[PDB]
Amino acid sequence: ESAGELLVATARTQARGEVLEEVRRRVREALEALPQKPEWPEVVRKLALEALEALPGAKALVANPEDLPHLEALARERGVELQAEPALRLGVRAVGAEGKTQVENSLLARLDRAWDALSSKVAQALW
Amino acid sequence: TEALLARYRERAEAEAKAVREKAMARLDEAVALVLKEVLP
Amino acid sequence: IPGIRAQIRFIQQVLEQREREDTFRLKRIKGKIEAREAEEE
Amino acid sequence: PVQRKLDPNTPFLTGMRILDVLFPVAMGGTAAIPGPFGAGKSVTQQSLAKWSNADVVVYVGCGERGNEMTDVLVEFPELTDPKTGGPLMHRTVLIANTSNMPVAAREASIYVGVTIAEYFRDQGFSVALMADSTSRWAEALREISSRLEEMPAEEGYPPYLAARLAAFYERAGKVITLGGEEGAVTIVGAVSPPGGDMSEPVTQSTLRIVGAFWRLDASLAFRRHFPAINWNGSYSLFTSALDPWYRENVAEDYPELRDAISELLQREAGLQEIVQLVGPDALQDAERLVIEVGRIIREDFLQQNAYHEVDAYCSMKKAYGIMKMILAFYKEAEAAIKRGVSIDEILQLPVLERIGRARYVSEEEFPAYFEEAMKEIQGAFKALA
Amino acid sequence: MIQGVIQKIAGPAVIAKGMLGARMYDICKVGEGLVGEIIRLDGDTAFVQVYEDTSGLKVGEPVVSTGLPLAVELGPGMLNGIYDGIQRPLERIREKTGIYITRGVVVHALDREKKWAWTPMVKPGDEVRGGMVLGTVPEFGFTHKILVPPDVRGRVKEVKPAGEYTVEEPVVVLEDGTELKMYHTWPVRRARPVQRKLDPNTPFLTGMRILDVLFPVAMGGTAAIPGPFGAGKSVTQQSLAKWSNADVVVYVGCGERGNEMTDVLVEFPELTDPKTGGPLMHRTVLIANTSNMPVAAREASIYVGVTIAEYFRDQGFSVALMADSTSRWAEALREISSRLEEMPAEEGYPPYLAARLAAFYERAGKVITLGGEEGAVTIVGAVSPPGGDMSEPVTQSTLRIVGAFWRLDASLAFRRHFPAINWNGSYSLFTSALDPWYRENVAEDYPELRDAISELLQREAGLQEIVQLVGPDALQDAERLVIEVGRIIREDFLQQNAYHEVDAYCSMKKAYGIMKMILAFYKEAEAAIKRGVSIDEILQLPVLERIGRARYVSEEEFPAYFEEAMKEIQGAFKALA
Amino acid sequence: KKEYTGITYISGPLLFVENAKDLAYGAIVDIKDGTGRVRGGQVIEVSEEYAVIQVFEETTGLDLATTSVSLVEDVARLGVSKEMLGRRFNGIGKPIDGLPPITPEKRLPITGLPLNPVARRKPEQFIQTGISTIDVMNTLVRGQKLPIFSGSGLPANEIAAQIARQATVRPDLSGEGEKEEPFAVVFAAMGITQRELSYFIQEFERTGALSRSVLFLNKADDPTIERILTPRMALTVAEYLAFEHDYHVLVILTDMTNYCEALREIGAAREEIPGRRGYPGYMYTDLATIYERAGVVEGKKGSVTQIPILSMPDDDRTHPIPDLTGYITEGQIQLSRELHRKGIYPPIDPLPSLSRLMNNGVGKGKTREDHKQVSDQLYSAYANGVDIRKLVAIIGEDALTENDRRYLQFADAFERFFINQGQQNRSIEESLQIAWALLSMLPQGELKRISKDHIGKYYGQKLEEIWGAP
Amino acid sequence: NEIAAQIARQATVRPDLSGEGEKEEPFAVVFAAMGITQRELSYFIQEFERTGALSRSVLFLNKADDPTIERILTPRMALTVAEYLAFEHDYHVLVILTDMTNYCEALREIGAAREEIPGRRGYPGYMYTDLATIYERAGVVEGKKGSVTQIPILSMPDDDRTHPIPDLTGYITEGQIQLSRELHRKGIYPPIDPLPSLSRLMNNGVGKGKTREDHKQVSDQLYSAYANGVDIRKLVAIIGEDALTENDRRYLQFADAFERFFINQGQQNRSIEESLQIAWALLSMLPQGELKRISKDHIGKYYGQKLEEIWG
Ligand SMILES: Nc1ncnc2c1ncn2[C@@H]1O[C@H](COP(=O)(O)OP(=O)(O)O)[C@@H](O)[C@H]1O
Ligand SMILES: [Mg+2]
């Protein structure tokens, strides 16, 4: 006789999950549409410098072929090797000096790492 | 006495529709907040 | 009753002795593997 | 992979009275048969392979004698499949790895057998998988770990033995296949603890996973009383879920008869404690009657001759009739005891011979034999009084 | 100050490099700083056993060695307080952190903010030795004496005038530059020195007739009791704490379960000191550890408690120390030993369990303090083996060094007999040494009365087979008389109500009077039986009511009641004839 | 996203990675292989040379040239919320009910901090479990740790589910008369099979008890570290609810024997010397840390109650697991194989069962004033009847007195009606009424353990109670 | 050793019962000794000289004063010779191993010298496989007339059936013949204890066309009656003997007569017919109603014969 309340709760939970999924999809679209914006070179500059400073010393720096024109200047400034790799997208990868350690700063990884934390904030703000 | 669940089913459907229509009106603000927070 | 008690204590002593021997063998193998991995340099 | 796991509702008919009645195992469940050497594990597994109602039977000879494999190979082709009537070997897949074969191949044999069973389940059949001994698998793992120079957990076994056993046993179950059909795998594995010690870690690890447990007894084997299953040390967790099937397909009051038999056995076991203390003659008439009924149940119902042309297979209805006869005789005997009749007079009543010989009656003559025996039982007490 | 960095983390064991010169058993701060203990030295490497959880630590974090072993702070402010296994006040921890004990918290055992009324007793230019008295501080009605540390010698250069000061104030400065405060530190694993240890020739009055008479314990002796459930051990311990000779009571929990410790913590503050109107907690120190607290605290709580007791008796008082469950401490010791991969001796216990138990129990005794005054420590440690088996190694090791054993029994409590000490299993070894004191201070015939009572109880216990087979009414006159005398003894002398206003405490004189009355009545009854009087007539005499109400008579009004009852005992038999 | 690729050694559950000193001890990491599959692990040992990681799953397909290890979290933590009620989890916080993942209000370390002894208070009130044998003779008190000692084939799961879906609080009996305090149930399952999982899911769904329950379910084929982590996560959720939202929480642990076996396997995998009977030497401390998280706190209206369940290996009470469990907890409930074989459910044996906190949970302001006397009289009478039933076998019925026959009939009726309640949900008043009806079979003067007032007020009722609920 | 020598001396097939033709092929004995003493070796040599079996016997002798490591290779060489003979020249081989305990001792010594992880009581973990590689070399091969029969001998330490050596041997072999010390102390020879003994391949050579048709039922009835007598012995040891029912007295007397006549046979050779006749005479001590494991036809054909009529 009280199962209708449970079904209502499940429906509300499914609606909340659908709303969160829609927000995720919109944020994903906004992130993947970034390389068409004038702020994109500055974002990749920030990613490159953050990756290079996270490792105390980087033997080489890996960048996307479309990203290297906007980061070659500080690639030469920092004195690290530049190497091209088609597979990388929306970020740069820095390889440690010893070659055993590598750091990745793609925007997809950042979104994956931060969405689980900002889910509570966006749920509080939206409703 | 076997048709009690239909009214609860339709009430749950109405609640879900109300929740989604309420949430649709504020998606852009949340998306902007997420973009502001993620981007350094 | 006393015979059963004596049998019980005898069995307990035997089991405890076997457990102690197994523990000593485990410590021996740990010590010898440590010695090998240390002297291999 | 499978679509979904289903709840077990149909029983796995092994053809043995004690296993089919007292400790049933459902289609898609698991069972274990531990015991010392010479207790009758291999003969029991061969009996299940010959007489079970599974579509396909997969037999894994993990680290046991080769003569068993030779016996199976020689004898199975001359037998007939109970379902289709063709040769029995046409439904059997045999994986053999004898004692003198390489040690590392036992794990491979177990995995190959269970994978073949899973594939035949995926085809939509009902597969029964029987492993000859997982103790040899544990010993092979111990030998491999010793060669690896690992740290043993207990009695030399590697730490992951319990995890491997659980992974092997969790493959069984009744499923909805990826093609939309329905199939099931039933796994029955024998355990051979060293020295018959049931506290050995393999037996304890198995005991916490299987849904049915069939413990063997050395004393019963010494008396040549087979199948020599320790009633006190066994159990089954599928009894409650299989009750509707028993009601629908066997008889309406089958669970009540099974419960009555179990209660009588429990009372006899309880009275045995006083019997071994003060002797059988120190009891009253009712206690002596209970002891005699327990003896009759043990010798005429639980017992089964695996080498007999008729007693080897016993359907559910035959066992139901036998237990109904035993219960009716017990009721009449206790009623007569309330009337002052001496216990010694009851024990010489000729219907006991009929009850004892009812086990050897063929599956065709049983329907009339049961009626005649019930009428004789009623006459021996009601008409006499 | 030796400093190093973390080299290697594996469970609770931390390896630190660059720690050359670190002493063997110093306490270390590991991490940002968790408390640890050095257990091994190897080159520049030291092995540290961290007390608390090490999750979250990283290689390269600082390691600082304090340079001192585990020690307690001895000084004013310990009474009326509750401490954990390593002397951390729980009240201030709760105030700082809330309901949980967050790791890495640091507090001081003695409050540094409270002000005490200093009162010097020394003058400039006076030579001072270890253990001498420097001053006086009032504390809840006690005269707390500031003592020189045992290993300090010199002469006084200056002394501060009387006033208000904190424990950190250097009240006395020696001519060598040494500054003496109101407190000092002492390692918990070293016994405090004494001038001389005296012989056990004085009794420890418990206030319970059975323990004070049948199984006495000497002042400074050791006793052990079982802890079976339902036997009323807690009320017995509370009565002992309330009515003992000790001026100061020290209670150690050492790893008991949570709810029992909660009951102990909520029961003592509601107890009242019999000698005044205030609560008993003003002369009690509580050490509490639950079974989920760090194992090192549970292992060191016993030593902390015994060291505090040693300090308090060094001040010149009598101290009663109660270890709640030495079995839990033995379990903690076994766990610590297993952490070191030591070879177990018997049933998993380390081979040095007996040595540790002896080292703990031998700190008890009555000694002449370094100040020349008398003090003592009495230890009553309870053992509660799992299953109640007395063959368990901890019980065997304990019974070989204790001087008394008071076997609590659940069967006696089941039939509503209290304080439920089984007289068949209990025994004591202090009777011979205490006999002269009994003759001097109680009566010249006290040992004879005690032996007569014990013999009567033994004879009553010897007949239990026949009275159980055929019943009491089938016996002869002498057997029935013995049974009834034993029943009267059990119901009027051994039994005692702890909650009763006047029956809670019994002096030696009242017990002696009751024993003499019982023996006289037994003699008169046997004489009447010899004169042909029926047993039923004897069992209906009115003086039995006077005997039964004896234990409920006030202490000061007892002698008149005793004289009247003694006169009535001889009157009732001779006059009736 | 930090990535370490200096792996130099793989064997069994352990793998070594080089130049990874940034990994904190006890952290959670995930291993990614060439095929892209991601499997998790925990850091066991870290030093300047290399770090040691124990893999959750099997290490098939790993290689030293293509795999990589990345950090997930410094310390194992769980995200809790007040909306976790009605959800199912796999034991590491992953939902398995198909609903969207919860939004965590806050994240808490699963290895919770010990309670301050001076902050606890004395347990005072009881829990109505709906079972007469537990409610009357072995009363459960809010804040007690009362384990259930089961066997091999005994129906422990059925009793656990029945208690979970029947337990409730009784504020009216204490005088409050309002359901102000919410009630919640936390269910933890360790090393269960598929059949047990399906049974638990069906039982919780079919009666509506899921709306107030949180389930942490760990299968038998799941990684053992998940089995280790399940009780800690369950207790973290329970403590959060009780001490931050004034909930009354009942925690049920399905099988502590599986937990002990998993702990032994984990200890052996890290090359540690076992203690007694091959079990780890720190088993007592681990079990104490699990059990001691329950209790009641001064200044808080919430409470936590635990009912651990364990199967004795060989029906031995001297085995280390039940021995330590009884050495830590405050009693036990003993299941009897004889009663189960005689068709009695639930097969709880009153004679060896015990509750050490019952005297606090009963009285005049709670339950009823005659609770304790009725309980002890029932215990004594049942013991006497059971003892007489053994002698009647040899000496016959006619050689007994009238009192012996009355005791025998009382014991038989007690076993038939009191213990064998089936699936009924008996309140405390109904159980007391049944007990008084059973006691009315004995003579008036035979009730030596009860005061005359209660006897005069309640004696004389006939047996017409169990027939009111077939 | 006496039982082994008697078996080697008296062993023979019965082709007439099986109708296989009177081939009458003598057995070839391959004898392998491991750490045997001088007394036992001299006894075996004297017995083989007396029976004239040395003309068709291969001996591999490893005396107790020989090095302990040589015991590793002796059984393998003996079984290699036996296999070669049987499967290349159609011989019938009876292999006797003097003592497997010495072989296990040598194996444990080698394992401890190499620091293997032990099993129970220090024995190496691969002892099961090592013993299987020796025991499982016997049998009959399809398409060949040869045969290899193995009769290992081992002494249980302290008469412990749970010791690793006898336990693994039972787990590998096809049964065992267990001797009882109590029977030996009562003067019964051979002291073969029937209850713990077992023959796994017993039913493959008994039936209608093989030996006699009543073999299996008589064996089962004998086992049941002996077990009943053994239980009644404990009952008599517990309570007074005068309280026994007549059935209990009958079972007790049957057990005593069984021990004194069927088991204790001395150094004489019994044909299968004589053994069956003695078994039926012993079973005749019980009423016909108690023979529940024997069909009525065999009872009618054989029951009733007197024990004293066999010899007098
Ligand atoms: N059900 C049975 N009916 C008749 N004889 C049996 C039965 N079970 C076992 N036996 C006998 O007991 C022997 C036991 O050997 P086996 O079954 O191979 O034991 P295990 O599997 O323990 O090695 C069988 O060879 C057979 O002679
Ligand atoms: Mg077999």
Numbering used by the authors:
A (entry chain J): 61 to 187
B (entry chain I): 81 to 120
C (entry chain G): 169 to 209
D (entry chain A): 194 to 578
E (entry chain B): 1 to 32, 34 to 578
F (entry chain D): 5 to 474
G (entry chain F): 161 to 472
From the paper:
V/A-ATPase is a motor protein that shares a common rotary catalytic mechanism with FoF1 ATP synthase. Here, we report the atomic models of 18 catalytic intermediates of the V1 domain of V/A-ATPase under different reaction conditions, determined by single particle cryo-EM.
To determine the ATP-waiting structure of V/A-ATPase, we prepared a cryo-grid with a reaction mixture containing 4 µM enzyme, 50 µM ATP, and the ATP regeneration system, pre-incubated for 300 s. Hereafter we refer to the structure as V2nuc. State2 of V2nuc returns to state1 via state3 of V2nuc by the same process.
